[PDB]
Amino acid sequence: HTMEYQHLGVVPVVSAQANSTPLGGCTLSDGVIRAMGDAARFHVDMEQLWQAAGSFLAEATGSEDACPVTGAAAGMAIAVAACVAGTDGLRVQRLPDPGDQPNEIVLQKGHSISYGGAPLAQMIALGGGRAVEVGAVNETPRSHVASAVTRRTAALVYVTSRTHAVHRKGVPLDELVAIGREHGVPVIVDAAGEGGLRRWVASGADLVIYSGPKMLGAPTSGFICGRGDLVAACRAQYSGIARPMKVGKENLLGLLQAVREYTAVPEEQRAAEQLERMTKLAARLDKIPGLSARTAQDDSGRTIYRVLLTVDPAASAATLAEEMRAGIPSIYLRDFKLHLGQLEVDPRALSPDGEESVVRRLEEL
Template sequence: MPTLHHDLGVPPAINASGRMTALGGSVLGDGVIAAMGDAARHHVVMDDLLDAVGREIARATGTEAGCPTTGAASGVAIAVASLIAGTDVSRVEALPDPGGAPCEVILPRGHSVYFGAPIRQMIALGGGRPVEVGSANKVTADHLAGAIGPRTAALLYVQSHHAVQKGMVSLAETIEVGRRHDIPVIVDAAAEEDLKHWPATGADLVVYSGGKAVGGPASGMICGSAARIAACRAQYGGIARPMKVGKETLFGLVQALRDYGTAEPGGHRARMEKLAARLADLPGITTRVVGDEAGRAIHRTELTVDPAAAGRDAATLASELASTGVHLRDHLAVTGRLLIDPRPLRPDEEDHLVDRLTALVEGGAR
C-alpha cells in the first residue's frame, strides 16, 4: 500500500549520522506515538497542560520547574528573553527590543556555533546582544570576567560537539565567574544524555532538546528554579508565541521523558567494533572505534578514507552514499574522516549501509 513517503517522493533515509534535525531528529517509540495520538483526539486547557509538562520536566531533570519549548534553539531564545524581561508584561511585549535593560550575553568565541543557524541569532531573537570573548581556540575565565559590565544579562555556555573542545573555559569556571559577579548562567546542553547532571552544576537555566537524546518528537525544554522558569513561561506572551508547542508534541515529550533511561544504554562499543571489522578490508578505508568528542557515552565507527586507494575523498564518498539514501556523520570529512553513529541505526539498516558502502568503494577503487 503506498505511503506518504511514496506520495511525496521523500523515501525514508538510513541515518548513520546521529539524532540530527536535518534527518528528522529521532524515530519515535511506540509509546510516544500512542501518546501523541491520544493527545490528537481531545481538547485540553493548554495552560494546565503546560504546568503539568513543566512538572514532568522538573522530575526528569531534578530541578524545581521546567518549561517546554519547540526545540533547544527556541529554548536559548526564550531563556535569554526571560533574563532580560523577566515577568514584566511591558518588557516581555517589547522584545526583542530590550530598551534600557541589560541585554549583553557573553559567550566564549569557541562556543559561537552554527548548528543549522547561528546561536548568535537565537540570542538576538530573545532581545540579547551576543558578546564573544577570547579567541576561537583559547578562552579563559578572565576573558569572561573582563567583558562583564552594567549591560551584561547572562553568560552562555554551549555543551556540544559543535563547540571547540580544547582551550575553552570550563563550565565550573563559567559558573564561578557568574556567581562572583551575580550574573546568571545559561547552559545549552541540547543533545546531552544525562539530564540531571547539567542542572546540578549550578547553572541557572539549562536547555535541552527533546528530539535528540531523549528520543521524543521535535521539541525542547528549559529547566531551573521556579522563579527562573516562571519568567521563561511569561515569554509565551511575547517572542515565544510563534514558538508555541502543540498538545500532541507535549504528550509525546512527556512519554519520551518517562521512557528515557529504560532503553539500551549508550556506548555501543561492541557493536561498533564488529562493524569496524566488517568494513576493515575495504580498499582505501581504515576503521577504528572512537568515543564521542564532547564526552557523551557514545562510541562510533570511524572511517578514514585514502582518496588514492578508495577512488574518491571522504566528502565525495559521503555525498555518493547520501545519494543512495545512506547518511554518515560527515562533519570531519575535510580531515578525511567519516563516522557511523549506532544510535539511530537498526541492524537491517546497518546491513544496507555495509552493502552500499562496499559496492561504492569496491566498484570505484583503483
C-alpha cells in the same frame, strides 16, 4: 487512504550521522507515537498541561521547574528573553526591544555556534539581548569574562557541545557559575544534545536547555529546566517572542513519553549494546576491499561508539561520501573527518535494517 511519505514522492533515507535536524530529527518508538495520538483526542487547559509537564521534566532533571519549547534554538531565545524582560507582560510584548533593562549576554568566542545556519547570537537578538563575545577561539581567560560582566549584563551563555563549540583554554562551566554568583547574573546553558539529564543542572546554572530529537528520542520538542523564578519568566514569553514558537500538545506528550522511556533504560545497557553492535559492524567493514574499520570511542570523551572508516584512495574519501548519499537507499555518514581522509558511521539513528543498507551499499563499490 492516509497520506504517507511515498504519496509525496519523499523516499526515506538512512541516517548514519545520528539525529540530524535536516533529516527529520529522530524516529519515535511505538510508545512515543501512541502518546502523540492519545493527546490529540482531547482539549486540555494548556496552562495546566504546561505546569504539569514542567514538574515532570524538573523531576527527571533534578531542577526546580521546567518549561517546554520547540527545541534548543528556541530555548536560547526564550531563556535570554526571560533574563531580559522577566515576567512583565508589557516588556515581554515589546521584545526584541529591551527598553530600559540590561540586555548584554556574555559568552566565549569559541561558543558562538549556529543552529542550522541561524547563529546563536541571532537567537540572543530575538530575545531582546545583545551578544558580547569575549576572548578568542583558542583562548579565553577567566579574567576576560569577569571584567566583561557589568551592570548592563543580563546573562551568561555556555555551550556544552564539544562537537560544535571549541573549549580549548576556555572558561569551564563551574567558573561561569562562580562568576554569575559573584555579580548576580544568570547562567544559561546550551545542552542541546547532552545525554546527562542531571549533571548540567547540578553545576548550579540557572537555566539548562535540552533538545528533544537529539538523544531522548522525542518528536520536535525540547525544554528549559532550572531555577523556578526564571523558568516562570520563560513561560511568560509565550505571550511575546515565544508565541510563534508553538508547542503542540501532541509534541509535548510525545516528549514526556520519550523522557519516561529514556530514564528507564540504564546507561550501561545502552552503551554496552552500542559498543558490541559497532564492534561486530566494524569487522564486516574492515573486510571490504580497500577499507579499514575499527570501533572508536567519541573523540570528545563520551560513551558513544562508531566505526571510523579509512577510505584509502587506493580503492577518494570525499567522493565516496557523496556516493552514499546518492544511492537508491540514501545514506548520510559523518564527514567531519573527511580532511583526514576518514568517515564515521553513527548508530544513534541507524536501524538494524539501516546497518545492512550501509554494508550492502558499501560492498557495491
